[PDB]
DNA sequence: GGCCGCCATACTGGAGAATCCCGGTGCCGAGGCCGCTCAATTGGTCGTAGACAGCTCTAGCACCGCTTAAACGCACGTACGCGCTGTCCCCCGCGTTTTAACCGCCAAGGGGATTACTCCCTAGTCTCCAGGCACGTGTCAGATATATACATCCTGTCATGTAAGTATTAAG
DNA sequence: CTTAATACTTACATGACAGGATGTATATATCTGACACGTGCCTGGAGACTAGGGAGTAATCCCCTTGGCGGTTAAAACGCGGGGGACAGCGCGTACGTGCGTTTAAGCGGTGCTAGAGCTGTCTACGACCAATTGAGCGGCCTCGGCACCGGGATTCTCCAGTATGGCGGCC
């Protein structure tokens, strides 16, 4: 007489796997127990951040008239947001390129 | 139009005659005090301040070319 | 066949279609996003472990995770992530 | 069998192009050997950690995920080869 | 007379190009030879995945991006535009190594 | 009770004393207020972290252990305070 | 005449003395008032362990010591003895602030 | 009525009196010792945890700590560190 | 009834507490199971490191004609060792001061 | 000295090419479809973790009172940053030549990984004893104070390298 | 006689050498409190045994890395030139560096408060463990059109040649 087993991501109405995140925290050895709202809240934060960065990636790709995300778009999206730049200052992107960044003394008169 | 800047520069250097000579800084600020342009004509002053050292009416004290000090000739 | 190697492809794919139904994504960008989600996951996990250490807590709860967010994540995106995380844990609390 | 000079295989025009990506327009003659030296020392700082991982893994084949760990240890967190 | 660009014009065009570009600037196989060379200087006859070699390549290229950006900032602060190894040493010291 | 202009409480000669400890020979007049702003931003970050520690602990008094944790999470680890 | 040292003599004497010294260089009471002031801007009526205030004092002092030696490295790299705000801005931005 | 607070006092005292029988101790220098012991212990323990994760080993043995010493401790000291560690595990297995 | 016990520090013949380091490893959330040689290995490493730095501090104290260590001696000992500086580049020391260091242009003549 | 002409350099319009912008075209990652599996789940359950409550007691907070340390401010003074050319210097631009990198194509096996096996190895726990911290104290090393000695740095002083007028005398 | 060239005496700065004086280091008396040493205890470390699991070890295979072969031209590399850079020289307006008295508020010594920091009993919320079950997500495949690669015209870059203006140069 077992009821229908739904998913905690759908119970939060979210897309990241709450079960996988709670599993990885239980086996990642960061605490003995994990609070009930902790993986849901963590997954919500991660999904919200992923949502902004994917929106920025799609906007940058559309601005670059391309319909598929390339790592160039990801670097241009991350480095042009100040708070994400402070998040990912020391983070290396594979094949992302660099910002177009020239100093004013480097440009001619 | 007016007179050429050679007369202006000679007046600028003859205004003071310090024992240690007028810098290019002090003389261009002196010419700006007169009202003569020193910003776009700095190439003209640039060539002039070696043309006069070469021509011998003025001698260069401690600097080289147009740098440093300048003083009047002996006679 | 081989053993299944779990990754974050399909969830990133769904969130991308939520924010952009029209566009595609490359597998290299997919791996970069997997590195992003794993990196921030481990950062927040280590920070919450440190807070559980400092508070001598056997359990990391959503208070600990919120504390680790507001420590790590800068400013207005952090307070937003608080807002959607709070809304999410409320509507998950109401099943 | 042995190799003795492949640091010069990282060619001067490659360094020129990198500084073009790095935004440097004029690159002194003394720059190239300085870059070779610093890339040299940094690459032992990387590969020492990476190999130490590898015989800690009891392996003989070097994996990229070892490079990822060695870089994130040195604050050089890599996106694009995890997992 | 052939049309010839002023000094830096091709250099700044290369700057715009390679900042636009995303590809690697190092040849993969001599770099692989150097990696194997320094590897056998620590432990003889290691085997290397090619992806590890390109990962080392792109990590080194990212480091070079960072250290010439810091070096260019120093040289501008050093009232220069030709960078010098003294700038690189200064940036290396400021970064804490 | 309200405190208004205590950024000037860190005096200019105190900044000169620190620059002597930093080995600075000549200190411009613009150095002091810029220094005040820089330390303001730095200690604002530190106190943000350490207070966040304090209300996460459901405490009201700022303790030195929280100061140590906040400093070391910015890579500025301090010894001698129960860490 | 009354005796008077040249500019730099007392400066270098203070430099060697404060490099020799280990005490705090900040008036403690206005520093405590300032940290209470800044922390009041976040949450009200906040209280401080006094030892935590002195800990913030030497942490601030040594952080500025590191910033100032980096600043002096930039200034001597800019061939100067008089430090100016672009030195500190360069140090912050290269260090990552 | 008070509660015990643990520190690394007597051990560093024993070690100092072994290397310098006539040298005294200031208390805040001892605080720097306790904080240094805690700092380096946490660094090496976190590195051992990470290596245990990366080799998928749920048990951290002396090999993990040896790897951590080879990583964090630079060179000459690390070589000496391996020397007392090998001699210590040998004499511990012999005892 | 029972064998008379020696500490495992005494079994190693090392002064650092093997039991205390072992329990701080097991309760520090690094692994649920810990190999036996790990805490004795780490404790030997720590005791050797403190032995070296205490030796350096003692010699520095004898240089300054002071019988007792001071954190000025600790600052002089850490900052004048290259590998210890590599260990503690980012570590702040209370009441330590800095190295006596004057740049060459700062000196007269 | 005035007056008048001549060229250097800043403006100012013209031409060739590197790359962007438009098509065009085949193709191979993208993503969609399909089989698989393991992984999330769900509920009992069972032990347990932290919020709560109450207290308590102590160290920061507030208030106060001398007391000069230090900030402050003013003021002389020397040195500092750097602006601009000058002058040596040097590294990119261009172009060509060589050579091995790249491609792409093929052989072969090393160990990465996977499964199996059996063996170490260590956390836990009741209990037992033993050391290290809590706490108190007590006593000489260094802080502090007082009288000397060098440092040292500015100040005071003298010899020396260097620039210049006309006597004098020799030649027109 | 007139005139002119030089050398010698006369004028200017510069660096070389001695000395004090006060700040900083050097030698001697005090005291104190904090290093340091001695004591209660109870928490902490652990011996024995066990449960049970991770993990070392064999093997094999296969595929993914290593080894080799032919052809291109991408890349390296070498060198001439040219125009930019780097950095010193020197001066100058300045800009703190530093001497010094005041003020005052930090510093130092003294008093009362309670906020709250933290110890202790409760217990009720909490969240992991386990048998089973599934369904969504992952291994594999397979098409296709957005993109990879290719080709032609503009834009734009960008240098390069032809003009006012202004400084530079000459005569009567």
**Is residue B33 exposed (0-12), middle (13-18) or buried (19+ Cβ within 10 Å)?**
exposed
User: Which nucleotides of chain K are near protein (any atom < 7 Å from a CB)?
Assistant: 13, 21-25, 34-36, 43-48, 54-56, 64-66, 75-77, 82-93, 95-100, 105-107, 115-120, 126-129, 133-140, 146-147, 157-161, 166-169
Neighbours of chain G (3+ CB pairs under 8 A): E, F, I
Domain boundaries, chain D: 1-83
Q: Determine the distance in angstroms separating the CA of I104 from the nearest CA of chain H, rounded to an integer.
A: 30
| Torsion (CA) G75, G81, G85, G91 in degrees, nearest 10 | 30
Number of folded domains that form chain G? 1
Q: How many CA atoms lie within 13 A of F82 on its CB side?
A: 12
Q: Is F55 exposed, middle or buried (0-12, 13-18, 19+ CB in 10 A)?
A: exposed
Please give the structure tokens belonging to residue I1. Answer: 């009834």
CA distances from E60 to A17, E28, G69 (A): 35, 12, 29
Q: Give the gyration radius of chain F's Cα atoms.
A: 15
- DSSP β-bridge partners for residue C59: A33
Q: How far is I56 from chain G (nearest CA, A)?
A: 19
Contact I31 A29 (CB under 8 A): yes
Tally of CB atoms within 10 A around H90: 10
Touching check for G3 and chain I: CB below 8 Å? no
* Residue where the block lists tokens 């900042």: E19
Give backbone dihedrals phi and psi of I34, rounded to 5 degrees, phi first: -130, 130
Say yes or no: D79 contacts chain C, CB-CB below 8 A: yes
- For chain G, state the CA radius of gyration: 18
* Pair of tokens at residue I12: 């190693």
User: How far apart (Å, rounded) are the C-alpha atoms in residues E55 and F25?
Assistant: 45
Specify which residues B60 forms β-bridges with.
B70
Residue that is written with structure tokens 């049309």 in the block? E3
Structure tokens at B5: 């800047």
Q: Which CATH architecture has domain A8-87?
A: Orthogonal Bundle (1.10)
Question: H/E element holding D62?
Answer: strand D61-62
Whose CA is nearest the C1' atom of nucleotide K23? G13
Q: Which chains neighbour B (Cβ–Cβ under 8 Å, 3 or more pairs)?
A: none
The torsion region of residue I95 among left (phi > 0), alpha (psi -120 to 50) and beta comes to left
Q: Largest Cα–Cα distance of chain G, in whole Å?
A: 58
Contact partners, residue F64, CB within 8 Å, separation at least 6: F81, F82, G49, G51, G52, G55
Q: Please give the Cα distance from E78 to G77 (Å, whole number).
A: 6
Please answer whether residues D44 and D50 qualify as being in contact, where contact means their C-beta atoms are separated by less than 8 angstroms: no
Element (H, E) at A91: strand A91-93
If you ran DSSP here, which 8-state letter would residue E48 be given? E
Q: Is C55 on the interface with F (CB under 8 A)?
A: yes
For G95, the 3-state DSSP assignment is: helix
Cβ of F53: how many Cβ atoms within 10 Å?
25
Structure-token pair, residue C57: 């807590």
Helix (H) or strand (E) holding F78: strand F77-78
Q: Which CATH architecture has domain F1-83?
A: Orthogonal Bundle (1.10)
Rounded Cα gap, residues E2 and G51, in angstroms = 75
Cα–Cα–Cα angle for C15, C20, C22, nearest 5°? 130
Alpha-carbon gap, residue C86 to C70, rounded angstroms: 13
For residue F73, the Cα-to-chain-centroid distance in whole angstroms is 14
B17: left (phi over 0), alpha (psi -120 to 50) or beta: left
Instruction: Please list, residue by residue across G16-47, b when 16 or more beta carbons sit within 10 angstroms of its beta carbon and e when fewer do.
Output: eebbebbebbbeeebbbbbbbbbbeeeeeebe
How many beta carbons lie within 10 A of that of residue G6, not counting itself?
Answer: 8
Minimal CA separation from G3 to chain F, in Å:
21
DSSP code, position A29 = T
Q: Which two tokens stand for residue G54?
A: 């002195």
Hunting for tokens 């820089």 — which residue is that? F38
Give residue for tokens 């430090």: G83
CA–CA dist I33, I17 (Å, integer): 19
Angle D14-D20-D21 (CA atoms, 0-180°, nearest 5)?
95
Distance CA C23, CA C29 (A): 13
Tokens of I74: 């600790």
**Residues 6 or more apart from E82 whose CB is under 8 A from it?**
D26, D27, D28, E75
**G32 is in which domain, residue-wise?**
1-97
Q: What angle do CA E64, E69, E71 make, to 5 degrees?
A: 90
From the DSSP assignment, how many helices (H) and strands (E) are in chain A?
A: 5, 3
In whole angstroms, give the CA distance from residue B11 to residue C54.
Answer: 78
Kindly state the tokens that stand for C69.
């967010």
Instruction: Give dist(CA I58, CA I79) in Å, integer.
Output: 15
DSSP string for D5-25: --STTS-HHHHHHHHHHTT--
Cβ atoms of residues A40 and A21 within 8 Å: no
The CATH architecture that domain I8-66 belongs to is Orthogonal Bundle (1.10)
I94 and chain F in contact, CB less than 8 A = yes
* In the block, residue with structure tokens 């003889």: E44
Count of helices and strands (H, E) across chain B: 3, 2
CB-CB neighbours of E39 under 10 Å: 22
A69 DSSP β-pair partners: C25
Domain range summary for chain C, segments of one domain joined by +: 1-95
- Take residue H29 and report the two structure tokens written for it: 């220098």
- Residues contacting F77, CB < 8 A, separation 6+: F68, F71, F83, H39, I90, I91, I92
- CA dihedral defined by A86, A89, A95, A100, rounded to 10 degrees? 70
Residue A68: strand pairing partners: C24
For residues G27 and F14, give the distance between their C-alpha atoms in angstroms, rounded to a whole number: 8
Q: Decide if I39 contacts I22 (C-beta within 8 A).
A: yes
Yes or no: say if C58 and A32 are a contact pair by the CB < 8 Å rule: yes
Nearest to E8, CA basis, from E57, E75, E61, E81: E81
D11, D15, D27, H1 from E27: Cα distances, Å: 8, 11, 20, 72
For residues H8 and H21, give the distance between their C-alpha atoms in angstroms, rounded to a whole number.
Answer: 18
Alpha-helical (H) ranges within chain I are 8-12, 18-26, 37-63, 71-79, 82-87
Spanning CA of G3 to C1' of J157, the rounded length in angstroms is 19
Q: What is the dihedral of CA C8, C14, C15, C21, to 10 degrees?
A: 140
Token pair for D21:
């990506």
Distance F79 CA to J54 C1' (A): 36
| C-alpha closest to that of I37 among D50, H69, D57 | H69
- Technique used to solve these coordinates: cryo-EM
- State in words which class domain C1-95 has: mainly alpha
CA neighbor of C24 nearest in space, from A61, E29, E83:
A61
CA dist E11 and F35 (Å) reads: 38
Domain ranges of chain I: 8-66
Burial class (CB in 10 A: 0-12, 13-18, 19+), A85: middle
Rounded to whole angstroms, the Cα distance separating G43 from G45 reads 7
CA distance G44 to C36: 37
Residues 6+ apart with CB under 8 A from E75: E81, E82, E83, E84, E87
SS (H, E, C) H33-88: HHHHHHHHHHHHHHHHHHHHHHCCCCEECHHHHHHHHHHHCCCHHHHHHHHHHHHH
CA dist., res. D81 & res. E51, Å (int):
8
- Flag if F21 and I101 touch (Cβ within 8 Å): no
G91 touches chain E (CB under 8 A): yes
Residues 6+ apart with CB under 8 A from F68: F77, F78, F81, F82, F83, G55, H35
Is-contact C28 A63, C-beta < 8 A? no
How does DSSP assign F6-69, residue by residue? GGGGS-HHHHHHHHHHTT-SEE-THHHHHHHHHHHHHHHHHHHHHHHHHHHTT--EEPHHHHHH
């Amino acid at each position: 007489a077992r009821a229908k087993a739904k998913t905690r991501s759908s119970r939060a109405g979210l897309q990241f796997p709450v079960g996988r995140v709670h599993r990885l925290l239980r086996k990642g050895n960061y605490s003995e127990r994990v609070g009930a709202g902790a993986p849901v809240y963590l997954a919500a934060v991660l999904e919200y951040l992923t949502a902004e960065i994917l929106e920025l990636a799609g906007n940058a790709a559309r601005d670059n008239k391309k319909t598929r995300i390339i790592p160039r778009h990801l670097q241009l999206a991350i480095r042009n947001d100040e708070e994400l730049n402070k998040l990912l200052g020391r983070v290396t992107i594979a094949q992302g390129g660099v910002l177009p960044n020239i100093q004013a003394v480097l440009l001619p008169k | 139009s007016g007179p050429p800047v050679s007369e202006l520069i000679t007046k600028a250097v003859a205004a003071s005659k310090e024992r240690s000579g007028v810098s290019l800084a002090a003389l261009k600020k002196a010419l700006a005090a007169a009202g003569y342009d020193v910003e776009k004509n700095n190439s003209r002053i640039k060539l002039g301040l070696k043309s006069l050292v070469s021509k011998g009416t003025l001698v260069q004290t401690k600097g080289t070319g147009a740098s440093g000090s300048f003083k009047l000739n002996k006679k | 066949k081989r053993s299944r190697k779990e990754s974050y492809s399909v969830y990133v794919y769904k969130v991308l279609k939520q924010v952009h139904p029209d566009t595609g994504i490359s597998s290299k960008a997919m791996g970069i996003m997997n590195s992003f989600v794993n990196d921030i996951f481990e950062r927040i996990a280590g920070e919450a472990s440190r807070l559980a250490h400092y508070n001598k807590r056997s359990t990391i709860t959503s208070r600990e995770i919120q504390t680790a967010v507001r420590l790590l994540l800068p400013g207005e995106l952090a307070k937003h992530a608080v807002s959607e995380g709070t809304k999410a844990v409320t509507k998950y609390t109401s099943a | 069998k042995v190799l003795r000079d492949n640091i010069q295989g990282i060619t001067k025009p490659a360094i020129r192009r990198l500084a073009r990506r790095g935004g440097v327009k004029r690159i002194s003659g003394l720059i190239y050997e300085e870059t070779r030296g610093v890339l040299k020392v940094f690459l032992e700082n990387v590969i020492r950690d990476a190999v130490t991982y590898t015989e800690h893994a009891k392996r003989k084949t070097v994996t990229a995920m070892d490079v990822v760990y060695a870089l994130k240890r040195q604050g050089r967190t890599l996106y694009g080869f995890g997992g | 007379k052939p049309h010839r660009y002023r000094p830096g014009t091709v250099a700044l065009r290369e700057i715009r190009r390679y900042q636009k570009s995303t590809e690697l600037l190092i040849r993969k196989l001599p770099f692989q030879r150097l990696v194997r060379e320094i590897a056998q200087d620590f432990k003889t006859d290691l085997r290397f995945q090619s992806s590890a070699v390109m990962a080392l390549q792109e990590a080194s290229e990212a480091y070079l991006v960072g250290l010439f950006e810091d070096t260019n900032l120093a040289a501008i602060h050093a009232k220069r535009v030709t960078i010098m190894p003294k700038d690189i040493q200064l940036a290396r010291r400021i970064r804490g190594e």
